[PDB]
């Protein structure tokens, strides 16, 4: 069952086989084995295929990489040609548009009924929305790309018959899809030309003379890719359409100033990025990666300017220039191309927008695609900085270990009484015995000379290997590694060249016994395969998969260390500055010579012996490789299978750590280092961490009467000196902090999902609003699943920002379009089936689809978008809100006498087993999902009957005031009342909330 969204890294190593079967030449993969390996049983009948042979009867033998062609297709493809799909997605367009105006309907009516509405009412509002949606640059291309996605999903579903081949002739472009592979025939004239007379794409695989006799009298060229680039391109087109529509809609409410950048600046940014990508290939994403740091630097400059406030922007600009001049000198760009390619960052730097607009612009970062990931480069990236020597200062390690022990002791003193009855000799701590005897703890000011004594403290096993009441951590249907005896069984057994001789097929106390006995060092429990990360703009990132017992050990260590430890290091005039440091680069920079004392102390804190140092004992003994299906490690044969050689994508001595694994211990060590810096340099430090970013705030404290100009400068200087001391300490510990990557700011704080400017929230909605798609991963393409995903996206979008209509209009556009896709083109059902005929027996008109799309889901219906949610995300009672929304909707239309025969329905034949599961809900099959004989026929029957449930009608028919929600309702109503009006334009002093004695 192929998916309709991007969820896997884009690897085109297998295409080398396809172009070998069609008699072409393509050097996609860096592994020479694929140049002469035996083709599989499939993707070899292409010699006997007639459609493919006829398709490739007018193209050169030499093909072209798809990295340089995706931006070309993103602009040269529009819907004018002929497609095999019978109901075109563009034919049911106006209806969708109509439905969108129906939320320029009731939503306005709902706000009017509540009392918010708007003081300024303009009659010319509906046609503005109609023109904004109709006059969208990425509208027809979006429909054509969705046609292509439907066609390729249908072709990939079969993959093993005559129905797996499809053809599209879109004006100047030809597309031939065969079983998870796609052939693009494009004109030569579209490709940008190198100064040598060849396309920029062909200079990477062919010499100048070689790519001049291969073409000769040929006007079209062919590029082979997987049926995954279609999904990526469809996603990019959908995201671009969504953001352009949102930007265009947002300006009609308040033309004076909106919270979104524009609908024209984003267009030229897209064009510049596409041109840069077309010129530079996959290597050009190094420059697209700079959209977010540049936006952050621009936001930082939207306040009072200090000499070090503009250092970040200067550093990012210098990095951009160096990267641009580095990946270009080898390439032979034309003089005009060398000037045109310097438009992306040139426009980004010269932007003049409010901080809110820049924060929104920050979100459009994956709109240009993702690079093709090679296992070789991904392996070398971690090998370059995970097996190198480090220089360590034992004094800094000693201070950090002492601070670690001191923090543990302080945490045990603050709670659970006081102290822990040290079972150590009292002479070794001459100066801590005074505090222990008096049952007092030494405060910060004088703990600089008695810090070393904290090394000599001994105690019983403070915590215990207990309180674990969640088995979900031990099994979640994720990916692990195979055993050592059968490790090459992951790779496809035709690229290997040999058949793998070996083929693959409780209790917590047992986990402890397995870990203690050093049984993870057994010869069959050492693989640690790599797997490439999902959609990212990096050159390539990977995460590790381990054998199952060692995975259980890792999860046990994580749980124990998060429960017992890791609580001593929490995630939390006077002027406070702050700076943000990166935590992911720490993962590969940890060596055993530095983490051994901390690990041993963690082991001693429990009754366990050797559980917390599983990684350092087992990782260096493992054989490091990327578990990709179509490219094994280089020079992998049958003879040297038990001891594979070290190739460009393999290595042995992984001395460092791995991202994610043992994260709590490393976070605790970083917090200990921060505390050591705080102890050495007498400033109040507050450190917090969120995933891969650690924000450290330094408080200065001033004697007052110092104005406010020099105060901020002094606070910034104190933060700078604290950052310098922390960099010194960390570098002495073996982890290098880059000086030219730290903000060192005062008001603008960026942390996790929250960016604040002088305490004012920076809106962000394009992160979630632009992800709304008519097709999602909803198990067998459930319509309710897609609708719920769109509803959650709308929830998150309305959670931030202050505009209501952009996201509402986007979701309204997408819901109807998704319903139409599911009705006409369903992957599970056979081709040509109409779900509006198999259930109703009559054409499913606009009336029934519009009526069934507004009844709320909690009432057993299909609506997930109610306006009361716009005021607050947390809803006390979904049922009453749904009843009120349905009542108000049916009151707006002159169809009031339908409310009663619409909510009663027929309760489902279920016992009292689901009433407990759903506290506030109804026992109706319509509100449920797939949470509750071949499986295909059963799934088809459930899908048909569920479709029958919807769109049918007349066939299945102290006090009571929560004071917590009243304030939220009042503030939300006030915000909605005055969102596009000037502060001085408010003519209302106070508002009275009078409730009616009826409910």
């Amino acid at each position: 069952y192929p998916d309709a969204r991007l969820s896997s890294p884009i690897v085109l190593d297998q295409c080398d086989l396809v172009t070998r079967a069609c008699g072409l030449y393509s050097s996609y993969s860096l592994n020479p084995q694929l140049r002469n390996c035996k083709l599989p049983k499939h993707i070899y009948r292409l010699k006997y295929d007639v459609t493919v042979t006829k398709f490739l009867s007018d193209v050169p033998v030499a093909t072209l990489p798809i990295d340089f062609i995706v931006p070309i297709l993103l602009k040269a493809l529009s819907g004018n040609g002929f497609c095999p799909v019978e109901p075109r997605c563009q034919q049911f367009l106006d209806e969708i548009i109509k439905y969108t105006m129906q939320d320029a309907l009731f939503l306005k009516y709902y706000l009017k009924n509540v009392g918010a509405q708007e003081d300024c009412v303009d009659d010319h509002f509906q046609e503005k929305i109609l023109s904004s949606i109709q006059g969208n640059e990425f509208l027809h291309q979006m429909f054509f790309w969705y046609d292509l996605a439907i066609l390729t999903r249908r072709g990939r579903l079969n993959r093993g018959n005559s129905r797996s081949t499809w053809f599209v002739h879109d004006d100047l472009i030809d597309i031939l899809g065969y079983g998870d592979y796609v052939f693009w025939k494009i004109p030569i004239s579209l490709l940008p030309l190198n100064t040598q007379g060849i396309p920029h794409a062909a200079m990477d695989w062919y010499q100048t003379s070689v790519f001049k006799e291969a073409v000769q009298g040929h006007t079209h060229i062919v590029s082979v890719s997987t049926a995954d680039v279609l999904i990526m391109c469809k996603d990019l087109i959908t995201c671009r359409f969504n953001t352009t529509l949102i930007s265009k809609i947002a300006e009609v409410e308040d033309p004076v100033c909106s919270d979104y950048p524009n609908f024209k600046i984003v267009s030229m940014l897209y064009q510049s990025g596409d041109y840069l990508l077309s010129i530079l290939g996959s290597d050009g994403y190094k420059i697209i990666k700079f959209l977010e740091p540049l936006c952050l630097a621009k936001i930082q400059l939207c306040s009072k300017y200090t000499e070090r406030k503009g250092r970040f922007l200067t550093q990012m600009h210098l990095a951009v220039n160096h990267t641009l001049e580095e990946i270009t000198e080898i390439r032979a760009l034309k003089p005009s191309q060398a000037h045109k390619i310097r438009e992306f960052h040139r426009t980004l730097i010269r932007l003049e927008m409010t901080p809110q607009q820049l924060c929104e612009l920050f979100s459009i970062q994956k709109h240009w695609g993702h690079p093709v990931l090679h296992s070789e480069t991904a392996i070398q990236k971690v090998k370059k900085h995970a097996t190198v020597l480090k220089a360590l200062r034992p004094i800094v390690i000693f201070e950090t270990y002492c601070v670690f022990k001191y923090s543990i002791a302080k945490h045990y003193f603050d709670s659970q009484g006081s102290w822990y009855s040290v079972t150590s000799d009292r002479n070794l701590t001459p100066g801590l015995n005074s505090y222990i005897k008096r049952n007092q703890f030494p405060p910060l000011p004088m703990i600089k000379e008695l810090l070393w004594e904290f090394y000599h403290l001994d105690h019983p096993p403070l915590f215990s290997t207990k309180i674990i009441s969640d088995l979900s951590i031990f099994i979640k249907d994720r990916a692990t590694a195979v055993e050592r005896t059968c490790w090459d069984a992951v790779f496809e057994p035709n690229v290997l060249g040999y058949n793998p001789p070996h083929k693959f097929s409780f209790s917590i106390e047992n986990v402890l016994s397995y870990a203690q006995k050093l049984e993870y060092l057994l010869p069959q429990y050492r693989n640690f395969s790599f797997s490439l990360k999902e959609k990212e703009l990096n050159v390539g990132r990977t995460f590790g998969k381990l054998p199952y017992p060692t995975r259980n050990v890792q999860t046990l260590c994580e749980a124990l260390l998060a429960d017992g430890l890791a609580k001593a290091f929490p995630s939390n005039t006077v002027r406070g500055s702050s700076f943000v440091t990166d935590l992911e680069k720490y993962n590969l920079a940890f060596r055993y010579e530095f983490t051994a004392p901390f690990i041993e102390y963690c082991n001693r804190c429990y009754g366990v012996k050797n559980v917390f140092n599983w990684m350092h004992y087992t990782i260096p003994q493992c054989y490091m490789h990327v578990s990709d299906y179509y490219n094994p490690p280089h020079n992998l044969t049958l003879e040297n299978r038990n001891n594979p050689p070290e190739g460009p994508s393999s290595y042995r001595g992984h001395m460092g750590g791995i991202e994610g694994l043992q994260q709590k211990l490393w976070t605790s060590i970083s917090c200990a280092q921060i505390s050591l810096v705080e102890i050495k340099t007498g400033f109040k430090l507050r450190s917090a961490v969120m995933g891969d970013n650690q924000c450290i705030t330094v408080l200065s404290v001033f004697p007052l009467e110092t104005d406010a100009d020099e105060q901020e400068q002094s606070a910034e200087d104190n933060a700078a000196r604290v950052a310098a001391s922390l960099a010194k300490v960390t570098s002495a510990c073996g982890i290098f902090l880059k000086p030219d990557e730290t903000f060192v700011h005062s008001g603008f704080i960026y942390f996790g999902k929250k960016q604040y400017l002088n305490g004012v929230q920076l809106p962000q909605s394009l992160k979630t609003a632009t992800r709304m798609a008519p097709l999602s991963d909803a198990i067998f393409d459930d319509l309710q699943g897609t609708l719920a995903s769109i509803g959650t996206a709308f929830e998150r979008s309305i959670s931030e920002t202050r505009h209501i209509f952009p996201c509402r209009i986007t979701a309204a556009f997408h819901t109807f379009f998704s319903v139409r896709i599911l009705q006409y083109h369903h992957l599970g059902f056979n081709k040509g089936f109409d779900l509006g005929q198999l259930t109703l027996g009559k054409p499913l008109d606009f009336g029934t689809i519009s009526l069934a799309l507004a009844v709320p889901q909690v009432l057993g219906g299909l609506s997930f978008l109610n306006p009361e949610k716009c005021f607050y995300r947390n809803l006390g009672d979904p049922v009453t809100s749904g009843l009120f929304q349905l009542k108000t909707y049916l009151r707006m239309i002159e169809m009031d006498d339908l409310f009663l025969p619409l909510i009663a329905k027929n309760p489902g034949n279920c016992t009292a087993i689901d009433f407990v599961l759903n506290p506030s809900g109804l026992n109706v099959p319509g509100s449920q999902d797939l949470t509750s004989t071949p499986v295909l026929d059963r799934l088809r029957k459930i899908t048909l009957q569920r479709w029958s449930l919807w769109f049918s009608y007349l066939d299945h028919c102290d006090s009571n005031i929560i004071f917590q929600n009243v304030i939220n309702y009042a503030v939300a109503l006030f915000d909605i009342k005055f969102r596009n009006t000037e502060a001085t334009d408010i003519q209302y002093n106070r508002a009275h909330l009078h409730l009616t004695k009826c409910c």
Binding site: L301, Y305, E307, R308, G310, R311, F312, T314, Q315, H317, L318, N321, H339, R342, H345, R346, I349, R350, V388, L389, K390, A391, L392, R393, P394, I395, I397, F398, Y401, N427, L428, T429, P430, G431, W452, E453, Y455, H456, Y592, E593, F594, A596, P597, E600, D717, A720, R721, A723, A724, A727, K728, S731, A732, F736, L737, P739, D740, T742, V744
Partner: protein
């Protein structure tokens, strides 16, 4: 008779008591001497607490040093010997004194491994980090020219020549940092990049009373088409602050200059 014997016995007893009195006096003298002689041990307690503190500190430090190091460590002699056979730093961590390895790196006579010196230099790079010069970028003439170009629209405009001449003058006078700071301050104020350039020209103390540079150009083809609208006859006393940027000497001797 009996009385004489009694008198003799009494005299003997009195003499005896005299000897025990002398013995008791000697005992008292010895006891008081022994009591008075115990002074130094009482005051020795002051110099043992400091020894305890220092020795406990040393023991803690070196115990942590050894326990963080595996059973494979290799001695200094072994480290040097196995450094003699190619670079290949020895298995197991090795201990060096900071000054010793610092002197070792500079003295290129005994072939210190490349990885060791790279790691040592990476360690030392953060030693010279202060409250200042932490996020300070290194700005060169080419980098400053590229930064200024990114704000000036169009190509071939006279302001590009102004940027080139200002970068050359800053490089010559070693004042690129001041120029960049002025440019950034003017841009933060909201002025156009052209306004920032003219403010820098009329504000930095280097530029006033400095002759614009001369350049030899064969023909009018070399100058870009955008600049052709701003060529004026060379004044007798040109001033860069007055507006002129640079002057062109034609191959036939014609005098012509550029003004903004």
């Amino acid at each position: 008779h009996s009385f004489e014997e009694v008198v003799q016995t009494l005299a003997s007893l009195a003499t005896v008591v005299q000897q025990q009195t002398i013995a008791s006096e000697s005992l008292e003298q010895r006891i008081t001497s022994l009591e008075n002689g115990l002074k130094p041990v009482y005051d020795m307690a002051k110099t043992i607490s400091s020894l305890n503190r220092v020795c406990a500190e040393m023991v803690a430090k070196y115990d942590l040093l050894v326990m963080t190091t595996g059973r494979a460590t290799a001695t200094a002699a072994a480290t040097e010997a196995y450094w003699a056979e190619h670079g290949q730093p020895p298995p197991g961590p090795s201990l060096y004194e900071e000054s010793a390895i610092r002197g070792k790196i500079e003295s290129r006579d005994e072939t210190v491994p490349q990885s060791v010196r790279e790691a040592f230099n990476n360690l030392d790079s953060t030693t010279s980090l202060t409250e200042e010069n932490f996020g300070k970028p290194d700005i060169s003439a080419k980098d400053l020219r590229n930064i200024m170009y990114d704000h000036l629209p169009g190509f071939g405009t006279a302001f590009h020549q102004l940027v080139q001449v200002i970068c050359k003058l800053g490089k010559d006078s070693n004042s690129l940092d001041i120029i960049h700071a002025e440019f950034q301050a003017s841009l933060a104020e909201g002025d156009s990049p052209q306004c920032a350039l003219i403010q820098i020209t009329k504000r930095v103390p280097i530029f006033q009373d400095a002759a614009p540079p001369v350049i030899h150009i064969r023909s009018r083809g070399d100058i870009p088409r955008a600049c052709q609208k701003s060529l004026r006859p060379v004044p007798p006393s040109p001033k860069i602050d007055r507006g002129w940027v640079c002057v062109f000497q034609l191959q036939d001797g014609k005098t012509l200059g550029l003004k903004i």
